[PDB]
């Protein structure tokens, strides 16, 4: 009745932050943080199954491969798909800065999702 | 805000289990008879050598240990003048006149890899 | 808390003349200095643990190896010993006279490009 | 009329203790040997600048202040005909070709930063 539904997230990260925002964002953490890769985590669309995470927004060294942040998100997340740019798989073994030299976004941050194979 | 990921230290024989590892023999040797799957690291403990980024190799069977030393030192881009030791399982001194497929079935790991590690002189 | 490394202009020495004036460049500088090697580094495009160089072009006498000139690069960028820092022309003997590198590594405009990395690639 | 809010703020060295600078300094000195460590901060009675992003700078030895002009200019945006200094301890340097690294030697503070601060006023 008289209940307030108080809660996060209808929009996902590129929803909620301005492509100047983001650009900025990315433009800082690369200054402060040369070689680590800034990688957004997001819950696939239509994925049901798995659980949201607390966290969108990582960190990564540029050394770790695919393999290591897979497993990583696993952990995290207590069949797994992790597709860059919301489609497309990688090979496990690819350090993550090449894939963020190939995939990075327009506004310099690398986009994930994670889903249910 | 942003989550920092910190890297894992583990080696190649501590991140894949002993079942992985095994797989991973079986499948190289259909793939690649004539090669023989060297893992090679560096010292733990190494404070004069840089870390290379590729440490997994597939080595012809017919060079010696000469040959593979001096791959690895042209990939570290090392000078004549510089001193570099590959030691076997993390200790054992080869002769570089010893034929790779002699250091292979003599000194492969349980799981059919042969592990080895290189280091500089100062680390001595 | 954390410090914002500053850059300054990121253009590629070839961004930043053309291939005449690179070119003419080289004429000039091997007619005044015949027993030099001219030679352009710069630090590779993904490349962002090593820091930039304060100079991209540099006059390498003929008879210096690449092991050589690592090791005055390396210095000039104040490495310690265990930091990666491989060159790679446009990998080759490091025991080779630049003299010889220049004449079967040379671009077509004449200079001698060399990219440094922190993985040998 | 309008009512003129006017709150003090603190500047990097009110903000952080001597004994937290130098050792700043010490470290950065270790971690980055070929960087100079700057602080950049907008004038207190500055009247036409905007705020720069960052007050925390390493800046390559071999930036000279008008390359490093250069560069506050477009991370404050900076149309071209606006007016900009940037004041090495209160002043512009002459020299705008000297390395920062050789303007370090002689300008740094006693806690090892190299501090700045940028007006639209030279005076």
Redesign the interface.
Known sequence: DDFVTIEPSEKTFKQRRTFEQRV?DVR?????????I?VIIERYKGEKQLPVLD?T????????NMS??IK?IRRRLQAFFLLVNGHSMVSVSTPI?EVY?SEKDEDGFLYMVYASQ
């Open positions: 900025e800082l953490i690369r200054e402060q943080h040369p070689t680590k800034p966290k927004k990582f960190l990564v060294p540029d050394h770790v290591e942040l990583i800065s030299e």
